[PDB]
Ligand binder design. Structure first.
Ligand SMILES: O=C(O)CCCCCOc1ccccc1CN(C(=O)c1ccc(-c2cccc(F)c2)cc1)C1CC1
Ligand SMILES: CCCCCCCO[C@@H]1O[C@H](CO)[C@@H](O)[C@H](O)[C@H]1O
Length: 262
């Protein structure tokens, strides 16, 4: 039951996410360092990116260009999360409208949790591990673009202190997506039931994987609550950008995610 449950989730996680925390940590211990405008330019000229630069919206400025690259990665991680979720039998058993509801309100929490895997206190990996953008450079962007980034590093460094591996994260992320609290859900009892099974699997798994860790399971439950507050603040900053940065393009999928959030 729960052992094979977890194992199926773990394989779904390995199957659908290109960058795993294992791969990321090895690199973070070399990548081209982006820390100013010149190295950013060189990086765009020199590094392979998943989305091609001319494919981005028309250029406006440096801070906005960075934002577009963040937005590109966000949308790509949504696609991965969707296929990850669909690789879970109980998720695909849900009516398609409930699937969309869970992803809509779940993906950003899952993204910011997984983000910690490619983050340290000095910056984060970009371009599939080919580059490393410094936290200080991201801090130097003009508001509101620098403001929307720093809160994630703060969460990330604290989160990495728990020292989860990929197998723990697969269950953690599954639990975030299969959440019975999401607005507009049709079959709440069914999602609550799946959520409960995942959380049992998570505890079972952590007992085995981290036998000497103390209070880790309730600590992770608190991280789930923390991520909700993080995403609320994020959505508020995105609404601010929408209203005060009219020249900045917003990806339509992300726009569909944000119109009913406060
Ligand atoms: O939510 C939206 O509406 C999309 C909008 C998000 C905006 C805030 O995004 C971030 C905030 C904090 C940390 C990371 C991200 C974005 N992410 C990245 O992986 C990422 C970070 C930096 C760069 C990059 C690339 C080139 C130059 C440069 F200076 C930076 C590329 C990708 C993770 C969440 C997807
Ligand atoms: C797969 C069976 C066909 C599903 C048809 C039901 C569509 O319902 C719609 O689901 C959306 C969430 O996904 C909500 O945002 C809309 O308010 C709601 O009207």
């Amino acid at each position: 039951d729960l052992k094979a449950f977890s194992k199926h989730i773990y394989n779904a996680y390995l199957k659908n996410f290109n960058m795993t925390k294992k791969k990321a940590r090895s690199i973070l211990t070399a990548p081209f360092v982006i820390h100013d405008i010149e190295t950013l330019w060189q990086a765009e000229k020199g590094l392979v990116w998943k989305q091609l630069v001319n494919g981005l919206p028309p250029y406006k400025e440096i801070s906005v260009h960075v934002f577009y690259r963040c937005q590109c990665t966000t949308v790509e991680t949504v696609r991965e999360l969707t296929e990850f979720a669909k690789s879970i039998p109980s998720f695909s058993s849900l009516f398609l409208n409930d699937q969309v509801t869970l992803l809509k309100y779940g993906v950003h929490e899952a993204i910011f949790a997984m983000l910690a895997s490619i983050v340290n206190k000095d910056g984060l990996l970009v371009a599939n591990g080919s580059g490393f953008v410094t936290r200080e450079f991201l801090r130097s962007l003009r508001k509101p673009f620098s403001d929307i980034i720093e809160p994630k590093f703060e969460f990330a460094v604290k989160f990495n202190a728990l020292e989860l591996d990929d197998s723990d994260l697969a269950l953690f992320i599954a639990a975030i997506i299969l959440c019975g609290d999401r607005p507009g859900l049709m079959n709440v009892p069914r999602v609550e039931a799946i959520q409960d099974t995942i959380l049992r699997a998570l505890e079972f798994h952590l007992q085995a994987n981290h036998p000497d860790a103390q209070y880790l399971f309730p600590k992770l439950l608190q991280k789930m609550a923390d991520l909700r507050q993080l995403v609320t603040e994020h959505a508020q900053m995105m609404q601010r950008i929408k209203k005060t940065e009219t020249e900045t393009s917003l990806h339509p999928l992300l726009q569909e995610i944000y119109k009913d959030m406060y």
